[PDB]
Symmetry: C5
Amino acid sequence: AKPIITLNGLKIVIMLGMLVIILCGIRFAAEIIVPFILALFIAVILNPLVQHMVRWRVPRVLAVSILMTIIVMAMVLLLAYLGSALNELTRTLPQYRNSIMTPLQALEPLLQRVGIDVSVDQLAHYIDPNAAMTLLTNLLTQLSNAMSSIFLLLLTVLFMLLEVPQLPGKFQQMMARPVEGMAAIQRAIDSVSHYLVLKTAISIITGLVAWAMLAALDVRFAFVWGLLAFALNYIPNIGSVLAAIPPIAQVLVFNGFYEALLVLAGYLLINLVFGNILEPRIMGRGLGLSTLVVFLSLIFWGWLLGPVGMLLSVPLTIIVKIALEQTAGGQSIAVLLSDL
Amino acid sequence: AKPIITLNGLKIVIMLGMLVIILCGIRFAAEIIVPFILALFIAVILNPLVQHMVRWRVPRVLAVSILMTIIVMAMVLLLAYLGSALNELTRTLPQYRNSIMTPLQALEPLLQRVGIDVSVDQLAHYIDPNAAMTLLTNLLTQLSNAMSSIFLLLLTVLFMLLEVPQLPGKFQQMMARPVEGMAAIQRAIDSVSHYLVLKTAISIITGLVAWAMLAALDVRFAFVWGLLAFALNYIPNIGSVLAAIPPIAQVLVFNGFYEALLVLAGYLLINLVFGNILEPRIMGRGLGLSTLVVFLSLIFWGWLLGPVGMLLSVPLTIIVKIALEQTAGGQSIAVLLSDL
Amino acid sequence: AKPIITLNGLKIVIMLGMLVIILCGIRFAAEIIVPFILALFIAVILNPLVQHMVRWRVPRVLAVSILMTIIVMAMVLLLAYLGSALNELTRTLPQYRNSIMTPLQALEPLLQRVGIDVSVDQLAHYIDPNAAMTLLTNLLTQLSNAMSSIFLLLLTVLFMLLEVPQLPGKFQQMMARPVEGMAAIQRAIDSVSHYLVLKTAISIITGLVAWAMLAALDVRFAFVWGLLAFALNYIPNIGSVLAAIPPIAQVLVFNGFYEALLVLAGYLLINLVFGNILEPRIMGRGLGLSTLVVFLSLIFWGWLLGPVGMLLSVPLTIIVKIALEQTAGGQSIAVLLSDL
Amino acid sequence: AKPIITLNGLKIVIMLGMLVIILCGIRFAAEIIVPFILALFIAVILNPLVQHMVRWRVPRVLAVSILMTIIVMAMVLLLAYLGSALNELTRTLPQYRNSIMTPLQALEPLLQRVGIDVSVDQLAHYIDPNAAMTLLTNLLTQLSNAMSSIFLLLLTVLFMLLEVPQLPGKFQQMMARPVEGMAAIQRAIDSVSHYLVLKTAISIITGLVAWAMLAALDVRFAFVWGLLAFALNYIPNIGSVLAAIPPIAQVLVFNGFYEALLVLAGYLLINLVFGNILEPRIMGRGLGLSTLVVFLSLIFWGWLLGPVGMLLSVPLTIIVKIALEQTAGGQSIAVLLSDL
Amino acid sequence: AKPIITLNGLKIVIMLGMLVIILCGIRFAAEIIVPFILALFIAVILNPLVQHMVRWRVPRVLAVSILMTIIVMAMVLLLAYLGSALNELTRTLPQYRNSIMTPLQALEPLLQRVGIDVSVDQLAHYIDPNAAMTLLTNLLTQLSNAMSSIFLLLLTVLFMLLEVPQLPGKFQQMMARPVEGMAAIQRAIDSVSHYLVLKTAISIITGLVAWAMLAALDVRFAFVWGLLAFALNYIPNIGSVLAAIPPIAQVLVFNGFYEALLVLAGYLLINLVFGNILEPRIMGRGLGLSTLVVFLSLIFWGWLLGPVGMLLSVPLTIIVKIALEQTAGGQSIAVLLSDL
């Protein structure tokens, strides 16, 4: 045309440029956004419990206070247990590394082979040691420095729970159609709140069941593996499969094959019954994240929000999808994120 | 719709992008914004005093000059006293650290226990030493390098106090409805000014009372604890509770339990009477910051404006709330920050 | 004119400023954009294969699963082979470096010469060692750290292939004229998809033919040179010429002149027949990138997207050209990128 | 209202965001902006001299050439003199540091004292050594590396002076109401030009008078103190007071009290007569910078433009005030910067 | 007015903010912009030669190929010659440094002197050694690492020359009034192209003449000084004067005064005849850069585009001036850059 800079071109480019600026803003302010978001989600999870406890005619402030003391004591105790178990695992690591190393040496002389062993040696180093080394580093930096920030986060959660009673009056007194599209009678947090409550119930059930079954199969670190399964259950399909690995690795490299197969059968039973109780119990909607979008959101949020961004990705992407579902212009993106 | 980039979408994204830019601007220029804001608040605090001293028929410039000399001499003397007391505390620290360490060893052999001690050892390190170590570092960097900037800040305060007499003519001669919404007959600084004056009066009273009562209970560093209580009294509910801790820790770990309980009772008396004189004396408005918003503003301002941003957060959030209270579009946010 | 800031001036400057912001956004988020784009292209390449395998009445998920296992095993094996061959080349390097060094000493005493040898010594260092040193460094950092990200990329490819079946319903259910200009009945990915499929077929043919012919001429690292020719065949005219060099260097510096000439004749035959089968077999369009634009896009993408950006430049520039071809305002740029 | 993002809100936020961007631009390009601005001011200062010398029927180019040679030779000689005197001061420093240290020890045993001496020892270290140490560092980095850039700046000044004759034709031939508001018949540089000329005349007079009087009181570094007084005379009220200190310190710590009082009386005489000749001689306007705004502009410009930004702050703020004085929208800010 | 944020204010601030963004974009992407721009200019220079060679009925591709081989061989040989000569100069440096040092010692005892020698010693260190040291560093980093990028740049030049034949069809087929204002029948590159061709012819003549005359005066590094004169001839008035210095320094410090005066007379003859052949031969326009603007553009471009930005500044500023000459709004800036 006569001008090359079409006004629609300007709209597109301004939108993209300002989105880039916003993302660099979030990536830069991650150390607030992450604790605040996570505190918000924990508050959402714990609010039904506190509300029911109020239904037992218990003072609100008293209830939340005792609940927070319970939670913080449990976290401190769990940090101690994790420190002991983790150190034991660190000092026990290389023995079964060599135990699984030996079959590689056995299988190296394939008839009419052309490659070398040392590179596959490094790949095995990736398999047993290196992934264990990275998990070691991440978890140990957690138990080392986290207590400086876990306390802060719990404080934030306490304040949110305390102030919840006055919040409905504040939303009611403030129409502002954007905010009613975020969380009001036009429920766009009650959607995510229910999902979080149900998913956390399921994850607790899965973690406890896995821990109990592992104890029934007398494997070491049964509790840590149960915790890991619980934590990873939040990522819908990748998380459970990824969590099922380390126990299988331990049981196979220590005990053998038949028991490892039985343990994997146990995990399959767990994840199928909870592939068959999560959907029909409540949340028949089956909140619409296609597996691809789950993985992509995982990578995305974990890249800008940092590691814990990975843990809270899926709830956060659900939030974004719900918010853009009702916006007039953006409904296209919202249906793009959905599943069918 | 036919276009995905709705004009309202552009408005939202431009507003958010430009807010991100502004915040990165403030975070980047913190070393001016902080001293300037703090000098402004100190000038507001000291203006009534100077004005009353003028009412005693004292020259304005003379009055402010003598007052600033008084203030700077007091600050230098207090820095010296703080240096001596702080060094004494540093060299006295670990003894009662071990004194409180021993009961942990006593309580470790809980019947049917499963955890370890070393992690709880590190948690105690967090409790007595580490928090003391961080307070040590922060206060010592203050007394070390602050005198380069405290003098600058006092100079700024002096200039503001000097120029105040001509300011009303300048505001009067300049309608500019935004500025009258910031500070004019449409009072939006006289709101914050009165809050600061009253809160500082209360904080001085609390600090002096705590110092006197601690002296009546012959604890070491009674003056430093009084100063700390005064400084932390600015954060309404978190500050007093957080300030009440270190004296309780010292008295319990040195003397014992009954006297520590008496001291905590004294703090409760102080903070309840000033939970019962702050509101009814003057400022029946009880400037509307919900406790959650207080904590969030604390975290926010302390994150971008740096540490002293935490100290001046609450006045600053009050300023923002008042300014956005009367703006037509933004009144929703203003009611969101309020309390009920 | 009366104002200097013409509105058209604002449009131009806003467009340019926001483009700069976007580019700094991509350059900053390269570690996602690159794996995601590359996974998208690999998925496009492999989709016809999986679809044909489905035509053999094979389950979709089963087909993609087995194909991905095949691919990952092949990559691991190839990494091992590359490690061995690369280490052998590293420890063999300097001998023929000196072998080609000696003719420089022979040719230094040109009659009536004026220069020195040491600078030309450094130029030869650039020729045989240094370029080999840089290739060494790049390839070795690949085989060293890549396995952390190659697995991630393959995972992404697997997810895309898995979700493809539901995608057409999602595009169909979403008109949004921009998206139909990107990939719909208004084909702007089916254009790039076909180009990628055909170019990859040609590149595989070229790589295998070069490997076989080099084996027929019993040169060392025949397989590595075949792989390098395949990889560089993606850059249309520069890539093949640049890839033809290292084998010629090796054969000349080890064996001699006549055999090197025969090998170069073989490469000429390959690149002329595939300068004569690429065009007429299919893709009679001969996707319109003028050689200059090919080189410039190479430099550009390789500068912001990093090294692998160079490899995927040409497909990516084709994408941009196709997208801007149909846009009303930008068709000028699209014809500028074309060839005639 | 129905939308929260009021259009006025967008205007405010866009203005602030773009101002932040501009300031980050200037802060980033300081190493050009500062020499260019300073060269412009020096050219303005020297233009009347060159023009008068032309009135003596001297060739323009010849006049400016000889004047620039004079200036550069004087700067080189002054750098040498400064190097010698500065090194002498550096090696003489600590003796009178201890001389003034001893009275602190004498005054430490105040009756009924509570503090320590070591912190006040560090405060004295701030007083005599540290401020001298910082002045040492700044001046020495000047005399060390400045000659690389002083020559560049003088070159720029020479070019501006050379090209001035053709400039009026260029402004005349270019209406562009913004530029006539910057410098034209609507004088907004002739305002600053006259201020600079008069202030520099006054500063030269003050520097020479102080140097002569100090020589009459046979103090060491009389010339350096005269230079420092001249340089600091540019900041209207803070500068002279700050410059009067180091000579007083030297004379008191070496000689004693009565002579120091006489010297301070001499400075008071100088600064009162030039608080009584600057205003009435010419520039009865008394360019309107309230002392607070002087100090704030000092801090501001010195923060973004770097140290020499402090020296050229006041002229620069005068420029900004004059420019925004006549702009229709911004006249409010202009009256805000003024004095009354 | 009622609003302070005038719409014109927004236009000004948006223009300035986006210009700052663009400049930070160029400063950030300098390592592409510089080689691309420089390759474009070299292609423009060499295009007439190739076109004339085509007029001799020589194949276009063959002609450009042989010309590029010639150029690259000449560059490699010149790099070698430069390495040898530069190393010789480095190891010869300090002897005449001391030779010129001794007259400073002779001239130190000026009657009734007050300064010291050591600072003037450092100034002489600036004169003979330091400037030589900086030139050493810059040139040596060139001959060291440049060959990695010089080859790249020559490749770019080759591609541009190759593709030129099809370019006129592409511009013809694309009206887009902006592009015709950049380079079309509305010539705004044919303006710069002719300037570059003529200026390069003049610079070659000057370099060769200076080299020949220096050889006639048997000074060392006559060729290097000729090259330096050629390179600096691109900056119109500063460049020749700055280039004339090092030969004068060498001849004076080695040989003496009369021969140095003769050499300076030779340079004056050269630069006056080419101050008297450049203008009247062709380019009677005398492309309008006032000397001040030349210097300012030098500083500017050299600051953002880096060192070689200084070399290509003047052509680049000419380009900008020509482009903004015909734009309706910006013609004011274009006349501001001109000369009269």
